[PDB]
Design a protein around this nucleic acid. Sequence first.
RNA 1: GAACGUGAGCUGGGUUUAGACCGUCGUGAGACAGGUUAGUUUUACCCUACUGAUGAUGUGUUGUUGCCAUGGUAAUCCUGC
RNA 2: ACUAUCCAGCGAAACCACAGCCAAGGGAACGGGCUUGGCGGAAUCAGCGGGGAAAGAAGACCCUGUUGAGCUUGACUCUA
RNA 3: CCAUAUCCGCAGCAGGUCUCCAAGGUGAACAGCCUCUGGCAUGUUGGAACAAUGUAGGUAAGGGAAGUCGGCAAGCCGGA
RNA 4: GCCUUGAAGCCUAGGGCGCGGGCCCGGGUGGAGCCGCCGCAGGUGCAGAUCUUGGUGGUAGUAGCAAAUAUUCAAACGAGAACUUUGAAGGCCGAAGUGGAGAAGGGUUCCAUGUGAACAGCAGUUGAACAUGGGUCAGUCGGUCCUGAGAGAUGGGCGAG
Lengths: 15, 394, 153, 97
Amino acid sequence: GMWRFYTEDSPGLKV
Amino acid sequence: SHRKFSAPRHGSLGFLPRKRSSRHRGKVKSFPKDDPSKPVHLTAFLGYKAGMTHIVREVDRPGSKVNKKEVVEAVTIVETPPMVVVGIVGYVETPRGLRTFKTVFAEHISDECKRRFYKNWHKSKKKAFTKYCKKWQDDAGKRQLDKDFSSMKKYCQVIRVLAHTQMRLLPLRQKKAHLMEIQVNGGTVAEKLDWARERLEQQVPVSQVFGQDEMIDVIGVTKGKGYKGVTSRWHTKKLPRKTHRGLRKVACIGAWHPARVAFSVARAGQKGYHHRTEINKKIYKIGQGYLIKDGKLIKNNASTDYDLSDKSINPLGGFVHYGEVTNDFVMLKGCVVGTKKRVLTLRKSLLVQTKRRALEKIDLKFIDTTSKFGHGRFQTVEEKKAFMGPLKKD
Amino acid sequence: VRYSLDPENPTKSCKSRGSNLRVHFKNTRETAQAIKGMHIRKATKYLKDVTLQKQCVPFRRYNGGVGRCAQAKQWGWTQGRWPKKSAEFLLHMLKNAESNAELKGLDVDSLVIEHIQVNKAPKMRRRTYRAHGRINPYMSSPCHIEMILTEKE
Amino acid sequence: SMLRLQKRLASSVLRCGKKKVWLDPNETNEIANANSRQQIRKLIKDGLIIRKPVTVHSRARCRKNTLARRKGRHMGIGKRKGTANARMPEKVTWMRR
RNA sequence: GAACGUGAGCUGGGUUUAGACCGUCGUGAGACAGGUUAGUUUUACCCUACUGAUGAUGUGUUGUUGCCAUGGUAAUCCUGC
RNA sequence: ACUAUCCAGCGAAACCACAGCCAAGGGAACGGGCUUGGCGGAAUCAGCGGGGAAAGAAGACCCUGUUGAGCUUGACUCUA
RNA sequence: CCAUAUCCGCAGCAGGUCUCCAAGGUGAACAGCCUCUGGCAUGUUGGAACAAUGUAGGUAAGGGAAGUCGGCAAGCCGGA
RNA sequence: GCCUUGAAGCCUAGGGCGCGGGCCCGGGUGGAGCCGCCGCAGGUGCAGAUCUUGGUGGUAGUAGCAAAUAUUCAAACGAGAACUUUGAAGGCCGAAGUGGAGAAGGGUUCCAUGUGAACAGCAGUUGAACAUGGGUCAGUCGGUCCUGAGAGAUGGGCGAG
Ligand SMILES: [Mg+2]
Ligand SMILES: [Mg+2]
Ligand SMILES: [Mg+2]
Ligand SMILES: [Mg+2]
Ligand SMILES: [Mg+2]
Ligand SMILES: [Mg+2]
Ligand SMILES: [Mg+2]
Ligand SMILES: [Mg+2]
Ligand SMILES: [Mg+2]
Ligand SMILES: [Mg+2]
Ligand SMILES: [Mg+2]
Ligand SMILES: [Mg+2]
Ligand SMILES: [Mg+2]
Ligand SMILES: [Mg+2]
Ligand SMILES: [Mg+2]
Ligand SMILES: [Mg+2]
Ligand SMILES: [Mg+2]
Ligand SMILES: [Mg+2]
Ligand SMILES: [Mg+2]
Ligand SMILES: [Mg+2]
Ligand SMILES: [Mg+2]
Ligand SMILES: [Mg+2]
Ligand SMILES: [Mg+2]
Ligand SMILES: [Mg+2]
Ligand SMILES: [Mg+2]
Ligand SMILES: [Mg+2]
Ligand SMILES: [Mg+2]
Ligand SMILES: [Mg+2]
Ligand SMILES: [Mg+2]
Ligand SMILES: [Mg+2]
Ligand SMILES: [Mg+2]
Ligand SMILES: [Mg+2]
Ligand SMILES: [Mg+2]
Ligand SMILES: [Mg+2]
Ligand SMILES: [Mg+2]
Ligand SMILES: [Mg+2]
Ligand SMILES: [Mg+2]
Ligand SMILES: [Mg+2]
Ligand SMILES: [Mg+2]
Ligand SMILES: [Mg+2]
């Protein structure tokens, strides 16, 4: 289906 | 959190609905109040904008560094033929405001006034005021109309007069006249009816309204610019070069919880063609027209007491985009709203004038009639020829 | 075949029909609601003019995105467009109908358009090629038409 | 009507391209019934089919300016772009000597 | 102050992946609350709100001239004789 | 200058409980819907990006699991 | 056929895929600019008008890094 | 027991029953089998499961049909021309080319006549599409021959095979 991001970005980031 | 540094806002919220107006002629919101001591006079007048130029004069402001010296300053020229009266209207005062009570038109109304009706004058039959004008050449109409002026003496407090212009006398493409209501301010109601009832169907020049060295107001509609952004309509900072989705924008609007956009924030829309009102513009000069005793006379439009050259106000090549002025005009200090060929309204000042910068008086020395269609360097053709000489026009 | 709304007097009326026609349903529907109730000779002028951009059709239900015009003040509206293609195919039909009336022996220059009906139809299938290896359908949207004319002036 | 076949064939007989071939815009009937060779070579002889001439490319402009560069002109300091060794090298000058 | 206002408004210097360098610790793979360098920032054509633009209700139709509810609202400081 | 804009012709998608004007109150403690007040007028056009705790990917951070795998060794049991 | 349409890339996909031949002028020159032989119809459509925001190009009075994490980007010098 | 003097199934502002599960009548369509009682047996009753298969909507006549400078005038065929063809004019490729020939791969795409349903993301009188027919000629051009890095039988050895 549609693409929506590169898997090494992971837009929700909170460490 | 708060704002790091401080700054003031961009624009006024007074002029807020920046929409393009619903008119082409300046409306007057308020006229001056009236002392019943005064003689009977008028308050306003219609004129058109022609052009601009500059002027030299001498200065008698004391205590200054420019006193007893010459200065250079710009002006605007406004063409103003004499208007014509056609009709009357009387108002009355009520706890809801004012109310239009009754009106009267005259017996003869020229066609240039009737074109203000009749969107399509070309395929019309021109059957306006045909039946109303039949109760002037009549017996009962003389009884019918004159039973009404008596009412207006009795049940009214405010008198206004309908006038229109003379558009044959201009170079423009237009033929329709412009109407306007004007207020009569004087002693008493009965006087103003008698003054007007005599003055009906007659002409009214400018020198019967205004004089020299007087502050007035100017009312007219500004110059269009169309759809614009916020860096032209509101004058915000341009963002820097490294922005992605555009640069001539305002970034933030509001914050989260007032979860709505407020009318205080800048947006992108119309600019220009608005209604405005400016005050305290001076009159320097009132010029005559072209006229004929036995031949021509076009000197006194633009001849000071000093230069004594047989010159008119008109430049070489005429006024740009306008034409040729052949009529009486007025000369304002500074600048005004609107394009050329546009209709202006000229209202007396509603205040008292005691500042020396208003009370002072003026006498001109020089006026510039160079051509504005380039870099003009000559005042008149005659000097242009005497300097250069004979060309191949031989 | 079997029409909708079989008429009131089958001796003073004619009829025509088309099936499986490559025009857009949406524009064509609206053009029919504007031509309805007219005398045929009036309407043929109406449809030439649309083709020449001198009159218009107002888009009243299917109006998303559609633009504003000056000719739709006659109809009491703002929006309008000039669907050429639909106009022609309607014109070809009026001919078929007008002839049949001549064959049954009717007064031709007193005829009225009473009933026009448009309907959808089976959809044709193509494809278009998008990013990241994807495919999507480029489908078509044709129409049927049927219509009735009677003799009333 | 269609005449692309007739164009192609005439190219091969005249040994020119298809941009050098003139067909008569008026006598198109008699050409379209030329669906072969020997229906064509007749028509070349009759004059309906012609080989155009070359577009001119002249040289007087060059011959003229070179005739000046012999005498010396157009050779100053501000017309030179390569080192002297590129224009006329030293090794050659040595060998002549 | 307003989700320590505001990343489909910017930037991405720092911090907080993947490579790598020193010091201290661990036999060791490896760790550091120690330091240093390089490093992909997506989508508006939907509903609303906001700004601008047509039109709508009624007054028999149509036009000219005008009144006012209601809402906004703006002027501010210093020097010199 | 190419677009966006308008017209002719052809014509998709993601997404979608129902839907879509605000303040305060209480409530799973930050409501489009409830309660008390403010108010409320067809159908639409170009934009912009405040909200919809907007779309995408059964949270890689943290914990649990008597679920795993890569690597090391002085863990246990074995082996070429 | 041998490639901005016959090959592989889901497709007449701005991608990728081994070689031969090789004129005139300027100029050091298979650089770049114009032309002849041979080839084409502007690269999956057209017409009207010149708003906003964009993308690619340019210019700017006086001052000259005061901007910004950082002279990032642009500009100066440029051949003999 | 019901039935081609009309079964099942389906539709229904119609008449009615039962607390409910559900049912009986009436009217239209339709064309061949179906039901009630006492017992038996079970692949036996759906709103959902980021359920499975198929189909259809708002979105929406919207976003879009913008990398590489460029078209114009007349005539002809034709029901029919912004796009076919012919001519003329203006322009690009600029010999490391948008030119003329070939290997790998494809496999009839090649050539003529005809067509305009479908396809050629607009159109088309055109087409590498559709239909019907035709077309590749060798003592000397290549293979075939030789061997290369290397692969691989016999004898022998090993191995449950
Ligand atoms: Mg502050
Ligand atoms: Mg950036
Ligand atoms: Mg000028
Ligand atoms: Mg695509
Ligand atoms: Mg692909
Ligand atoms: Mg925050
Ligand atoms: Mg972001
Ligand atoms: Mg945000
Ligand atoms: Mg960093
Ligand atoms: Mg690292
Ligand atoms: Mg007020
Ligand atoms: Mg748009
Ligand atoms: Mg609230
Ligand atoms: Mg609370
Ligand atoms: Mg909600
Ligand atoms: Mg938002
Ligand atoms: Mg989880
Ligand atoms: Mg998980
Ligand atoms: Mg446990
Ligand atoms: Mg494993
Ligand atoms: Mg051990
Ligand atoms: Mg070039
Ligand atoms: Mg083209
Ligand atoms: Mg192509
Ligand atoms: Mg500067
Ligand atoms: Mg600094
Ligand atoms: Mg700073
Ligand atoms: Mg740089
Ligand atoms: Mg049977
Ligand atoms: Mg069973
Ligand atoms: Mg079951
Ligand atoms: Mg179900
Ligand atoms: Mg359930
Ligand atoms: Mg569009
Ligand atoms: Mg393109
Ligand atoms: Mg070739
Ligand atoms: Mg080639
Ligand atoms: Mg090959
Ligand atoms: Mg097509
Ligand atoms: Mg072929």
